[PDB]
C-alpha cells in the first residue's frame, strides 16, 4: 500500500 503507497499513496497517490
Known sequence: ???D
Open 1 to 3: 500500500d503507497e499513496v
